[PDB]
Amino acid sequence: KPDRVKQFLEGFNIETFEMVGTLSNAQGTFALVKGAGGVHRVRVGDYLGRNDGKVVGISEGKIDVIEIVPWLERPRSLTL
């Protein structure tokens, strides 16, 4: 079931985004996602796109997302 305050990158089409790298720093790991006119530092547990796309993993140049669609889980990836 889709649920919460939606994040910024939920207001745009996920197909327009691009994974451009992984950055880790003292606070943990982020995927660098180009979309909506900028590069965002996206964490595991953040959301991308219009279908409740939850970021569940960042590894090996790939973001793993689980969307919720008519409800079914539908994985998606964004890769370098």
What is the token pair recorded at 33?
A: 């996602």
Task: Give the dihedral of Cα atoms 57, 60, 62, 64; nearest 10 deg.
Answer: -20
Among 40, 52, 55, 63, binds Zn ion (CB under 5 A): 40
Please state the length of the chain: 80
Rule CB under 8 A: which of 18-47 touch a copy of itself? 18, 20-28, 30, 32, 34-41, 43, 45-46
For a copy of itself, the binding residues (CB under 8 A) are 5-8, 10-11, 15-16, 18, 20-28, 30, 32, 34-41, 43, 45-46, 61, 79-80
